[PDB]
Design an enzyme around this catalytic site. Structure first.
Site, short mmCIF file in Angstrom:
data_model
loop_
_atom_site.label_atom_id
_atom_site.label_comp_id
_atom_site.label_asym_id
_atom_site.label_seq_id
_atom_site.Cartn_x
_atom_site.Cartn_y
_atom_site.Cartn_z
N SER A 223 0.70 -1.15 -0.02
CA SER A 223 -0.05 0.12 0.11
C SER A 223 0.75 1.17 -0.06
O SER A 223 2.07 1.24 0.59
CB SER A 223 -1.01 -0.11 1.11
OG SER A 223 -1.61 1.10 1.35
N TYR B 275 -2.72 -1.58 10.15
CA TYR B 275 -2.58 -1.39 8.86
C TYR B 275 -1.27 -0.97 8.55
O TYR B 275 -0.35 -1.61 7.68
CB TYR B 275 -3.82 -0.99 8.13
CG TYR B 275 -3.66 -1.21 6.61
CD1 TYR B 275 -2.81 -0.28 5.59
CD2 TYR B 275 -4.34 -2.31 6.02
CE1 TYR B 275 -2.96 -0.64 4.19
CE2 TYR B 275 -4.24 -2.46 4.85
CZ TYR B 275 -3.80 -1.51 3.84
OH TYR B 275 -3.71 -1.94 2.51
N1 LIG Z 1 -8.36 -1.21 -3.08
C1 LIG Z 1 -7.47 -0.45 -2.51
O1 LIG Z 1 -7.71 0.89 -2.73
C2 LIG Z 1 -6.25 -0.90 -1.92
C3 LIG Z 1 -5.14 0.01 -1.67
C4 LIG Z 1 -4.07 -0.22 -1.32
C5 LIG Z 1 -3.73 -1.70 -1.05
N2 LIG Z 1 -4.78 -2.56 -1.01
C6 LIG Z 1 -4.56 -3.97 -0.67
O2 LIG Z 1 -4.79 -4.65 -1.83
C7 LIG Z 1 -5.05 -5.98 -1.27
C8 LIG Z 1 -6.49 -6.29 -1.93
O3 LIG Z 1 -7.69 -5.48 -1.34
P1 LIG Z 1 -8.93 -5.19 -2.16
O4 LIG Z 1 -9.05 -3.65 -2.58
O5 LIG Z 1 -9.01 -6.33 -3.36
O6 LIG Z 1 -9.93 -5.55 -1.16
P2 LIG Z 1 -10.62 -6.90 -0.75
O7 LIG Z 1 -11.37 -6.85 0.73
O8 LIG Z 1 -11.81 -7.29 -1.76
O9 LIG Z 1 -9.65 -8.18 -0.81
C9 LIG Z 1 -9.07 -8.71 0.23
C10 LIG Z 1 -9.17 -10.16 -0.10
O10 LIG Z 1 -8.65 -10.93 1.08
C11 LIG Z 1 -9.35 -11.96 1.59
N3 LIG Z 1 -8.84 -12.26 2.77
C12 LIG Z 1 -9.30 -11.76 3.98
N4 LIG Z 1 -8.73 -12.03 4.97
C13 LIG Z 1 -8.06 -13.34 4.59
C14 LIG Z 1 -7.59 -14.36 5.10
N5 LIG Z 1 -7.41 -14.49 6.58
N6 LIG Z 1 -7.37 -15.53 4.41
C15 LIG Z 1 -7.54 -15.44 3.06
N7 LIG Z 1 -8.05 -14.40 2.40
C16 LIG Z 1 -8.22 -13.46 3.22
C17 LIG Z 1 -10.63 -11.31 1.34
O11 LIG Z 1 -11.81 -12.37 1.52
C18 LIG Z 1 -10.51 -10.67 -0.07
O12 LIG Z 1 -10.81 -11.63 -0.97
C19 LIG Z 1 -5.01 -6.03 0.31
O13 LIG Z 1 -4.16 -6.48 0.73
C20 LIG Z 1 -5.34 -4.60 0.60
O14 LIG Z 1 -4.82 -4.19 1.88
C21 LIG Z 1 -6.16 -1.99 -1.56
#
Ligand SMILES: NC(=O)c1ccc[n+]([C@@H]2O[C@H](COP(=O)([O-])OP(=O)(O)OC[C@H]3O[C@@H](n4cnc5c(N)ncnc54)[C@H](O)[C@@H]3O)[C@@H](O)[C@H]2O)c1
Ligand SMILES: NC(=O)c1ccc[n+]([C@@H]2O[C@H](COP(=O)([O-])OP(=O)(O)OC[C@H]3O[C@@H](n4cnc5c(N)ncnc54)[C@H](O)[C@@H]3O)[C@@H](O)[C@H]2O)c1
Ligand SMILES: NC(=O)c1ccc[n+]([C@@H]2O[C@H](COP(=O)([O-])OP(=O)(O)OC[C@H]3O[C@@H](n4cnc5c(N)ncnc54)[C@H](O)[C@@H]3O)[C@@H](O)[C@H]2O)c1
Ligand SMILES: NC(=O)c1ccc[n+]([C@@H]2O[C@H](COP(=O)([O-])OP(=O)(O)OC[C@H]3O[C@@H](n4cnc5c(N)ncnc54)[C@H](O)[C@@H]3O)[C@@H](O)[C@H]2O)c1
Ligand SMILES: [Cl-]
Ligand SMILES: [Cl-]
Lengths: 259, 259, 259, 259
Positions: D145, D158
């Site tokens: 991130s 986080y």
């Molecule tokens: N979307 C954004 O703006 C953003 C920005 C920066 C970083 N991120 C990072 O990108 C990644 C994806 O986030 P996203 O936006 O796709 O959201 P999201 O919540 O849709 O994706 C997270 C995924 O991880 C899974 N997950 C959560 N806990 C878990 C566990 N214990 N075991 C297995 N799977 C688990 C969830 O079920 C989900 O499918 C994350 O690591 C998030 O921190 C996202």
């Protein structure tokens, strides 16, 4: 040296040995009131207490495991009960052990993350809670390492813990800056603490470590305690969210020296 | 405050105003011997000299343009001739002016790079030359900015100058660490120096700047001078190649506050 | 590989040798239109032109010294006159020479700052001016080095130039992001360009350099050209103000390897 | 786009939604073989599987909680059993929840550290173990991130997790570089994934987030998947231990725009 430190209450984790002990003694010299947290049943915290008092301070000793929420709360309560308040929280407890990363057991990872990062989170949380509840413009110092920036093969847990501590510190600094609460890291390089005495007793390992230090010597604990005293003081009134590296130049990439 | 600074010889560029003046006066409080470099006779360097002496130090003044090699050499020679040695060099002179980058004239770029970066290179070079030739474990402090890390639209020259100063400082620190010469940057945020008085007289601009400072206030020059005194002292014996930010939290990304 | 690069106009400084030549040829493979800037008539720019065309592109050659404002303007005008527009500006010209910092002549400092940093400023300025005036969502790539973060004793000028380039790039990226103009740095480690062939011909110096590269090999120019093609493409649509290091791990502190 | 990805086996955690799903589909477009890890069958992993196949790849699904050591091991074993090998490991699972730091429960801290940092450690460890045992020049991508550098009030867990992930990644990259195993982070800014749809449905919150993005728009998942495909490919052959930010300029300090 810092007149504003006189009578300030400072709690220090891991304070029965090494950097924590040196900080306790230095804060004694500044005429502060020191809460000496110790963990291990093998360290002689009362000796540190006596050195703090001899240096010009007051001191109480309290056993506590920084991975246990109740013990961290009790460190802060000890400050309040013994000295009336808390002004400065120094989260210094830490440990490390080498394992190839692809072989690193989760138990070892968890112990290092738990002690080094979660423990500092708990101490920071409890101190800041107290500061916010009592409108104290308090100070938190988190003991990090050059390894919040320098990667450390065989010590992936430790590196992660200190990289995490950096962003924890910066987040708390930003979040509580409007209340005048400062939060900073110190980043020591190689320091001649008793925990390292075995390693540095081997002249080859001592020489190898020295070869990675541009200033050419392993630091003394007092050189880290100096940094803590300054950061805690009003001299550093406009300084928050930093890491102050005290490393003889380690973070400058010693492999790139001319000679 | 720092007993080891008593009688040390410190030369400061840009010392007739703002941070340079505040540093000169603080070094006077530490009972140091100050060489006050000034740029124009309208600045009243003799008033700074008198304040240094009144604070407890000794002081001489010397005119010099840090974009002229001969003038920089003469600043160092003034220390040697008037006080017998040089211990601490502070490269503080600087300037800035806003222009959209795609419209920035080369003359403006050259003036800012020349003063802010090349000037600090020349001062560092001349001080270190003296230290190396005379086996002095001297100290260089380069006055940087939050803008060695924070980008600065309309001030691309200034940002480049300080980003450059960072790597210059770190290189010199690495290169001369084995001789016990320390080289560090200070990184101020917004400070209430006289040059800024117009801007901050406008309550809207003052409030806008304050909104970018997590600690909620514009710093005072004394809060930067405090950092310089500490870095120059033996308290910072193990500290080299750093930038010590004193910025009320500006580098923590103020747009990401909760509130 | 990148369909959106087909027909785009890219100007590259220092394109008659080394990384600039490799980038020209790669952009040829992407079916771009390449302006090959070269420095000296001793170089063979027409050979690069032929390789660009053979790879699938179009190419013109233009002599120009990036320390001369008029020559930089003429590079951009060459793109406009020959191909009708400019899409991508790559400021790649650079040089270095070793001197202990306390002995570094101002002439050597000025030449390296002038070529490496001021030259990139001028090219960036002229490209962005054109983009802004013609509503082009253009792209600037500045060729930096691991030495925008890694200090470099004996090369204080070079390190300063690249540290400066970092903040210049980030400033321009922030300033022009709202207009959809992206500005990024590439940070190569040790790359096997002909300029380095002397050094790496000596097996001892080759082995010494390899010992500082975690991946254990000196990179090839094509590995840097790959980065340029990607950054310039719409694949990197959300990427601005970064430095993309391609260094086999040099910035990870090779002195701290386990073995 | 990247011919060398054809037939490579990539395992992706959190692949039933958001960025992980977009990455699975993009690797399908590259004709890779994808192991889609999912958390709950209330997600519809078979739909992702079908989209991967339709894009041009092969795919299997495997349920697993990355906070459970055996589940992570089973993701890697699924790759081996279904496709014969593992080439690329993408640790993408994550979560976050806001709480004032001084009130942050240890249970929330532990869940975020455990999922976001420890989960990525376990996935990295198991993939690298396999690579080392089978002499595979494999690749690990850890989803970070902007908050590995940008502090995040209310999300101290986080921020710590991603700051820690940075040093974990860099450590693994240094440690395994000699075996040709690359390890890198991606650092997204604000991305329009389904988890964020509620927030960005509120026009005020959408506008507020956009005001912190220099490029002026919230990124699409495909813009992150583009970065993953490139990093995993041999185009990035000399790139290890980096964080590639894809953030529309968030890390450039949006409060410092010219205005
Ligand atoms: N979307 C954004 O703006 C953003 C920005 C920066 C970083 N991120 C990072 O990108 C990644 C994806 O986030 P996203 O936006 O796709 O959201 P999201 O919540 O849709 O994706 C997270 C995924 O991880 C899974 N997950 C959560 N806990 C878990 C566990 N214990 N075991 C297995 N799977 C688990 C969830 O079920 C989900 O499918 C994350 O690591 C998030 O921190 C996202
Ligand atoms: N000495 C160095 O070279 C060096 C370098 C960089 C960073 N550090 C850091 O400095 C700090 C102090 O290290 P040191 O060199 O003094 O070594 P040390 O091992 O003497 O200090 C650590 C102290 O923490 C205590 N401790 C361990 N687990 C604890 C727990 N769960 N609860 C409470 N206390 C606990 C130990 O008993 C010990 O007293 C640590 O955070 C370490 O990571 C030291
Ligand atoms: N005040 C702030 O908020 C702030 C913030 C960040 C950094 N800084 C830096 O701190 C330093 C001091 O700034 P200040 O706020 O005191 O402002 P200032 O303008 O009063 O100080 C700059 C001084 O440098 C002198 N100078 C300029 N060009 C010179 C030259 N060619 N030769 C010799 N002297 C020359 C000026 O005459 C002046 O005395 C500068 O480097 C500035 O960039 C200041
Ligand atoms: N090869 C490496 O290991 C390496 C590593 C890091 C960074 N770099 C950077 O990559 C860039 C290209 O270097 P290279 O390795 O290809 O070496 P090189 O010497 O082959 O290329 C530099 C080019 O710049 C040209 N040039 C020099 N001064 C100029 C001037 N004033 N005006 C116009 N052109 C001028 C030279 O004629 C040459 O063609 C440089 O900026 C260098 O600092 C190279
Ligand atoms: Cl190193
Ligand atoms: Cl910001």
């Amino acid at each position: 040296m810092y007149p504003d430190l006189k009578g300030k209450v400072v709690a220090i984790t891991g304070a029965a040995s090494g950097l924590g002990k040196a900080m306790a003694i230095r804060f004694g010299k500044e005429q502060a009131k020191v809460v000496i947290n110790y963990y291990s049943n093998k360290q002689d915290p009362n000796e540190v207490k006596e050195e703090v008092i001899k240096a010009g301070g007051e001191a109480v000793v309290v056993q506590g495991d920084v991975t246990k929420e109740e013990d961290v709360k009790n460190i802060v309560q000890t400050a309040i009960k013994e000295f009336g308040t808390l002004d400065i929280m120094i989260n210094n407890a830490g440990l490390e052990n080498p394992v190839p990363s692809h072989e690193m057991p989760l138990k070892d990872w968890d112990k290092v993350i738990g002690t080094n990062l979660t423990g500092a989170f708990l101490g920071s949380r409890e101190a800041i809670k107290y500061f916010v509840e009592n409108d104290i413009k308090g100070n938190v110092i988190n003991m990090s390492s050059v390894h919040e920036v320098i990667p450390w093969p065989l010590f992936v847990h430790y590196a992660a813990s200190k990289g995490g501590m950096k962003l924890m510190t910066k987040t708390l600094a930003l979040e509580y800056a409007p209340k005048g609460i400062r939060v900073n890291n110190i980043g020591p390089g190689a320091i001649n603490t008793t925990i390292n005495a075995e390693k540095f007793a081997d002249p080859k390992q001592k020489a190898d470590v020295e070869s990675m230090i541009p200033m050419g010597y392993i630091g003394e604990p007092e050189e880290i305690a100096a940094v803590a005293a300054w950061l805690a003081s009003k001299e550093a009134s406009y300084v928050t969210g930093i890491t102050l590296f005290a490393d003889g130049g380690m973070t400058l990439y010693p492999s790139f020296q001319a000679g």
